[PDB]
Amino acid sequence: DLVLNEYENQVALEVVAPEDIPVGFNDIGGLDDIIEELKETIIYPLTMPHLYKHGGALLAAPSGVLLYGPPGCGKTMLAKAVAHESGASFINLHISTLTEKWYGDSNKIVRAVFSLAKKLQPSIIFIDQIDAVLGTGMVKAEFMTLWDGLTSTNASGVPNRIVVLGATNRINDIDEAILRRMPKQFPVPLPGLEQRRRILELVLRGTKRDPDFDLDYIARVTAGMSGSDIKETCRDAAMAPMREYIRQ
Amino acid sequence: EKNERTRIKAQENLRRIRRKQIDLVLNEYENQVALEVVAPEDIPVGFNDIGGLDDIIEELKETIIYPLTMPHLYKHGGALLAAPSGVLLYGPPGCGKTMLAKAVAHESGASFINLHISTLTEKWYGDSNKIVRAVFSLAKKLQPSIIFIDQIDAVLGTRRSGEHEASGMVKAEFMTLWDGLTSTNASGVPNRIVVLGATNRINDIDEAILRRMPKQFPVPLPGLEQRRRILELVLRGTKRDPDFDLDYIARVTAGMSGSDIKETCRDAAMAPMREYIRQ
Amino acid sequence: DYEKNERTRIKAQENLRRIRRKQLVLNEYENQVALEVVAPEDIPVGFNDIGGLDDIIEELKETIIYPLTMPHLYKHGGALLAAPSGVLLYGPPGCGKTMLAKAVAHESGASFINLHISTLTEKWYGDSNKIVRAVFSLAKKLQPSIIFIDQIDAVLGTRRSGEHEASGMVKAEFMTLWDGLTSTNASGVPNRIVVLGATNRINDIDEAILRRMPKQFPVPLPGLEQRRRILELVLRGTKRDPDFDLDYIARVTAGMSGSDIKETCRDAAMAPMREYIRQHRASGKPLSEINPD
Amino acid sequence: EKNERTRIKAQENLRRIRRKQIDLVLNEYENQVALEVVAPEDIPVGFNDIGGLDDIIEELKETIIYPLTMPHLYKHGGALLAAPSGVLLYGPPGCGKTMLAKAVAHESGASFINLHISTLTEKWYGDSNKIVRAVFSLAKKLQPSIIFIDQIDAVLGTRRSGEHEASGMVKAEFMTLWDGLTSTNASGVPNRIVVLGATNRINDIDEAILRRMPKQFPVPLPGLEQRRRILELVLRGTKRDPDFDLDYIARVTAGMSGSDIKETCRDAAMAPMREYIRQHRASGKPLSEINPDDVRGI
Amino acid sequence: EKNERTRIKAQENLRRIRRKQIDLVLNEYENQVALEVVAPEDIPVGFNDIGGLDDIIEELKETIIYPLTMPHLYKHGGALLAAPSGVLLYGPPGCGKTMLAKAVAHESGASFINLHISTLTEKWYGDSNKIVRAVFSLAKKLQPSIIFIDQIDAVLGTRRSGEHEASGMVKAEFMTLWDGLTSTNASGVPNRIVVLGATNRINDIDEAILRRMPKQFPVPLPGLEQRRRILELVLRGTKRDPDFDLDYIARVTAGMSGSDIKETCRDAAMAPMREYIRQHRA
Amino acid sequence: RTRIKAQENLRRIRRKQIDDLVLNEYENQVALEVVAPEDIPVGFNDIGGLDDIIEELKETIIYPLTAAPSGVLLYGPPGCGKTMLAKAVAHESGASFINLHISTLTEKWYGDSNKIVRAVFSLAKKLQPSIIFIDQIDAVLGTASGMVKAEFMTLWDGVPNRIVVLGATNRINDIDEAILRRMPKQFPVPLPGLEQRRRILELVLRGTKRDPDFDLDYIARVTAGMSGSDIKETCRDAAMAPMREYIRQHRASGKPLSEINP
Ligand SMILES: Nc1ncnc2c1ncn2[C@@H]1O[C@H](COP(=O)(O)OP(=O)(O)OP(=O)(O)O)[C@@H](O)[C@H]1O
Ligand SMILES: Nc1ncnc2c1ncn2[C@@H]1O[C@H](COP(=O)(O)OP(=O)(O)OP(=O)(O)O)[C@@H](O)[C@H]1O
Ligand SMILES: Nc1ncnc2c1ncn2[C@@H]1O[C@H](COP(=O)(O)OP(=O)(O)OP(=O)(O)O)[C@@H](O)[C@H]1O
Ligand SMILES: Nc1ncnc2c1ncn2[C@@H]1O[C@H](COP(=O)(O)OP(=O)(O)OP(=O)(O)O)[C@@H](O)[C@H]1O
Ligand SMILES: Nc1ncnc2c1ncn2[C@@H]1O[C@H](COP(=O)(O)OP(=O)(O)OP(=O)(O)O)[C@@H](O)[C@H]1O
Ligand SMILES: [Mg+2]
Ligand SMILES: [Mg+2]
Ligand SMILES: [Mg+2]
Ligand SMILES: [Mg+2]
Ligand SMILES: [Mg+2]
């Protein structure tokens, strides 16, 4: 919905609009201090800075949020929520898109993604499964150049008010030169015995649960699985009383 | 095709009109590296804004900048007192090796240009070498020419036998333009152009480029005095509570490289701000 | 697609006129290399600005640069007594490899041309090979000529059995149009062309190209003796103390190449200028010291 | 465009007038390839100038030049006793290969042609395939003709999936014209055209093309006899016999190629000239006489 | 551009007349794709001189080359029982597939056209495609016909991103005029055209063109029974000297290509001709 | 040019009459391609047992042309019935089905490469309804060529005139991402299923007698892998078996005169 340089556009297809996102904060599972710190520091000053611009040149938003934990949707719901809550175009990266066909295609794509994130909207960049930047090669040094360099600060002295979330299952092998520029790092433990109660309450909104017992033992039934199979078991025990109801 | 060329020419012409006076012709390739000429009044951080490190602020000025800009003082020595043909800033990530580049581009008028790694890598066979040539030719036509390459250990590197061809002959044209046959002038003038580059590890940049960058300034972690300077410098416009003292934060901060200091200080600046939301 | 043609042709014509007046009809592609002929007046350094390479300079001059200029003196063994196909200046980086090229292009007398490796590689298919033949055609027209390709190891190389196509052809074109079916003449004169190249990585150029340039001069680091003359060559203009032991400087380094010595001399000469500028004196002044460190 | 093509056509017409002597009609494509017809008076190295390898010369002559040129003696044989499709001269770099093609151009008198690989690859699209068809449309208009492609490892070679798509056609147009549908005549003559290809990397030469050139002559480095013969041949023009002992130099040179023996002869042949110049530099101006002497090389 | 145009038109008129006679006016633009119309008599090889290959040589003669030539005896069927449009002839190099193409052009009966790769690739923009239209329109003007693209792996090929879009347009033009919207007639005849192919490798020709030509006959390496006949069928005029045990060379060759078996035979055939070196002696 | 305009007049008259207006010569060349309705042999029933995608066609694209969206892309892999579906559409459309023949677009002149596309759009708008079917649109509309590509979708957005364009590319995710979303509907043409393969077999085996081989029910059990064209090729190879055997038996003697027995 703006002027096109074409190379970056090979990225505009991934630019999710800030509206019509399924975020709906009440639906997310039990996560209090994580959402608290995000809504206080990453998205609160990311918009309406006039309630926040009392101190200039230092109250920008921290350009990097690292979400590390077990494999699951815990590192996805908050990321999708940040964009819809900040009036933010969720410009996903789609890491496999950075694969090399031309000699400098990945380099130009990494340039265009930051160019669009600076020009299009200050919303966020999302790098899921961060392993392209390990720490052991052109694109790796291309990130840290465009991230915080000569063109990062504007004439007013404030940064480009852009955030780049960090999604990865691994830690402490993430190219520490890049880990340095992801200030706010959040350990998100997907397995939760109390958050699972809230997530099951969210799931059972439309599901009929008259005969089955009150939602207590569900908080310990799949105690082993953290967040994924619980999302898959939403229909496991759901249709179980539903086969006989559909046939007759 | 032609429309894109004319549009890039309009960009370069406007950029030269805005940069020259605080217009010259160009070919197809330096017409693209001409979009990297950084205006000095754009980066709002100079030598007065970097803290802790002062000798590097001292060595970058009299040994490099003054020999480059207004060298008429350095005319007593004809060819030997010219400016150092290259500079490199190496150290652990977190210090201000890229922040020094901002100060050099802001508080030293030298026709600063920074070529990104994307400007060098090109799809078509041979365009990368021509881009390097265009860079070193614009650096001559426009020649205080403090060229910058951030993370120079990536576009350059210790070449192996099985290195990619397109990256193995752009390291060669780069060197051939840097101190090649046509480097000096007719009267012996060394053609003042400094290639300032940052890097986290001077271990695989090259064995023939490290000789080219003699002024290699290591940027170590700030000490007990440098941390105090950085704290007193980054809290200029922030709230000043009468109770806390900076020496406590500086003494407790053992490591915490300058970027880490800035981060842990920005995080501390949320104590009074969050309380206003409780209304 | 024509104005660039006119610009390149006028530049090539002016450059060739300059080289000719120092003492003619080119096609579309010979103009691309015609604007790279380096004139002797342009290069300021001669052979007298190289220290310690007096032994290598003799074998690089009397054997390849003066069977090639005035070959009338070498008329008895006209077949054998010709300029070799090329010199390979190989060695660790920072010692005379490009200084010797400068000296040859200045005080050679031959139609020197700097190749500017970007000129070899063109985006269009079948264009690098056209330039590779145009450069040798221009060298034959500029006979005698001394082609120079700094850092041979980039454009050339062991040809990587599965690798790029155009770069494989542009590298297989030197092999064809430099000692090929039409290198010699009707009498035996091999075109009086020498392709001199300076690379800091020997045994990576080619197995079939190291047979082409037979004269390969190793350029090592200076020793205890010729550093004493490299220091003298570098410190030729700076007014000095009546006594500073250059024996100490030449004997203490012991492991630094030519550029590493030039940098030390630069710092030692920058010391007094900085010490004088520290006195907040705006205008120039012709007096200072040279005291060693 | 016409102003340049007219001069081109005039130049190739002059070249063909010089070559054909003891007025063809040419289109634009195989016209510019007429600049490469190498006259026999332009290569002063016959088969009496290469020594050592003789079976390669013998088999080369009596299996190509006698079949290719002078076919009337091979007429009654049929289709078998005819010139082979092509020839591959392979081996280490710097021994005999390019110097065998020189003798075939000077000695065969069979309308030799030097391909000049760059002329194949044209910048425009579908202009390299036209030149590939043109080199065979001109090889047969002045048959017999020997098509020489020096260093057949880049323009040809193992076809891959990730080709340029512009060299894959020149790599396929060539083999479609050189052993294709309309090569043989109405009677069954295979065009009397030979493609001699010299290279040093045989295992990357488009193996489907290796079926085209059957006569593959290995050109190895010289031995105890070939080294001495190359020494005798390269040192012809030199007053070298005060106490010359070439039997010793032939054994000293262990395994260097034929061209390295030549460079050694060069370095050992101009040493006395350097000595004479250094002795005469004391006084006078160089007016060198015929009195140096060759004694011992390195 | 007209005098050379007149030369092209005159030469193509002569060629088309000599092919047809063993009347039609062109548009001067398909006037150069008709220059590859191979004559019937200028191909010295036929079907009776192909030893070894017998299943392929019969499948061509029965199911491809002869639903087309003399098709009136297939009128009992409808859309089926027609000549299948497309042949591949894939196999290793030098095993005798261009020889099969020669034999088909010599003893087929349809107007064989030896369409090269250059005649399809034109320098000007949007002109190579119209040359494709000219090729298929010429095949449709007289429609007993067998188009032949030798080595179909470069002019065709698996299309990638970019890769000279004006070239992928040519493949799209091929497979659009192949069986597009105007392939059949009002009755249902499949245009009466068959395109013969040839290629050392079928792995990247296409996924669409790979099925455009249904019959993909593999020509393998000659075995014992095939080499034992090729080695005897290559020796037509060579005077067989006495005591020549043919069975020895047939087995000692040990699975050699179809052309290398020709070279090994030419060597022995020219051995005595070269031994006739007495004339030099005298 | 006069011959071109004359042939165009004849073809457009034979199309329209089943009232003609002469127009510009540069707009006169594309009008040499107005295919007649009785020229195509195939009908809807000739297509196999798909009868769902063809249902969507007959329910949405042909009703407004008797509004209809602009842009109908075919999706199936090679050999599934894309060109067959487009042929049935051209035969029973009722509009004036005008193809392209992509070479008609690409002219080797500066001011003709887009004049021809403007001519195509002007002819489609002059007589209504119409269809601008482009065989394998992944070639003329890809990722002067730029002028044509831009010229196309600029004239794309032009009662909304009742023009509908239909593309029949055989490849997805490599085709005209700009104009891809601009055309609303895209119809995936999958491979034949059980009932689908049964319909293909029962429709192809129409002229030949009912005993070419064992039976048709058994043959439609192993055709799950092959596409819609390979099944036709296997069917025709099977049909050639009786004719092959009869001709081989007749080769012994007599003149090969046609007979009505396998
Ligand atoms: N000495 C200092 N004084 C003031 N601020 C500093 C200092 N050192 C670091 N900083 C702060 O930390 C950040 C330094 O980022 P910089 O561009 O130097 O990273 P970098 O050195 O390029 O990282 P890398 O070495 O991994 O490339 C800046 O935002 C700056 O405000
Ligand atoms: N023998 C010498 N005498 C005088 N100066 C020297 C000598 N060797 C090196 N230098 C100095 O080094 C610089 C030139 O370096 P040079 O071009 O020889 O390096 P190089 O061998 O080309 O390295 P590379 O091949 O990696 O480019 C000059 O500024 C010159 O003053
Ligand atoms: N048999 C020989 N007799 C005399 N001189 C020879 C012989 N073989 C090689 N030479 C010498 O070698 C040089 C030519 O080498 P040649 O052309 O054979 O190498 P090449 O095969 O072209 O190598 P490449 O193809 O790898 O470049 C000449 O200078 C010639 O004097
Ligand atoms: N059945 C055969 N009878 C006689 N000669 C054969 C036969 N098969 C192959 N040959 C020989 O093979 C040679 C070339 O065969 P052909 O041209 O048909 O293969 P090809 O099409 O060139 O293969 P490719 O093009 O894949 O390399 C001919 O000279 C011919 O003598
Ligand atoms: N459902 C079906 N019913 C009847 N015939 C079918 C069916 N599907 C495919 N066919 C057969 O497929 C053949 C036509 O193939 P088609 O034209 O659909 O390929 P295409 O997809 O257009 O090719 P491309 O993928 O290259 O565009 C016809 O002979 C037709 O009989
Ligand atoms: Mg940095
Ligand atoms: Mg150098
Ligand atoms: Mg050679
Ligand atoms: Mg063949
Ligand atoms: Mg189709």
Residue numbers in the entry:
A (entry chain F): 86 to 221, 231 to 342
B (entry chain E): 44 to 65, 86 to 342
C (entry chain D): 42 to 64, 87 to 356
D (entry chain C): 44 to 65, 86 to 361
E (entry chain B): 44 to 65, 86 to 345
F (entry chain A): 48 to 65, 85 to 132, 145 to 221, 229 to 243, 252 to 355
Question: What's written in the study?
Answer:
In addition, we expressed and purified a mutant form of Δ30-Msp1, Δ30-Msp1E214Q, bearing a commonly used ‘Walker B’ mutation that inactivates ATP hydrolysis but leaves ATP binding intact. Δ30-Msp1 formed homogeneous hexamers as assessed by size-exclusion chromatography, whereas Δ30-Msp1E214Q formed hexamers but also higher order oligomers. We incubated Δ30-Msp1 with ADP•BeFx, an ATP transition state analog that in ATPases (depending on whether BeFx is bound) can mimic both the ATP and the ADP states, and Δ30-Msp1E214Q with ATP. 3D classification of Δ30-Msp1E214Q particles revealed two distinct structures. The structure closely resembles the open conformation of Δ30-Msp1 (RSMD = 0.867). In Δ30-Msp1E214Q, M1-M5 display clear density for ATP, whereas M6 does not contain significant density for a nucleotide, again indicating that M6 is in a distinct conformation from the other subunits. Upon modeling the protein into the density, we observed in all three structures extra density in the central pore of the spiral, spanning its entire depth.
The AAA protein Msp1 (in yeast; ATAD1 in mammals) extracts the tail-anchored (TA) membrane proteins that have failed to be correctly inserted into the ER membrane. TA proteins that escape this reaction are mistargeted to the mitochondrial outer membrane (MOM), necessitating their removal. This proofreading function is performed by Msp1/ATAD1, which extracts the mistargeted TA proteins from the MOM to facilitate their subsequent proteasomal degradation. Here, we present a collection of three high-resolution Msp1 solution-state structures (an ATP hydrolysis-arrested Msp1 mutant and two conformational states of wildtype Msp1) that address these outstanding questions and begin to explain how particular features, shared by AAAMC proteins adapt it to its particular roles in protein quality control and beyond. To obtain a homogeneous sample suitable for structural studies, we expressed the cytosolic domain of Msp1 lacking its 30 amino acid N-terminal membrane anchor (Δ30-Msp1) from the thermophilic yeast Chaetomium thermophilum.
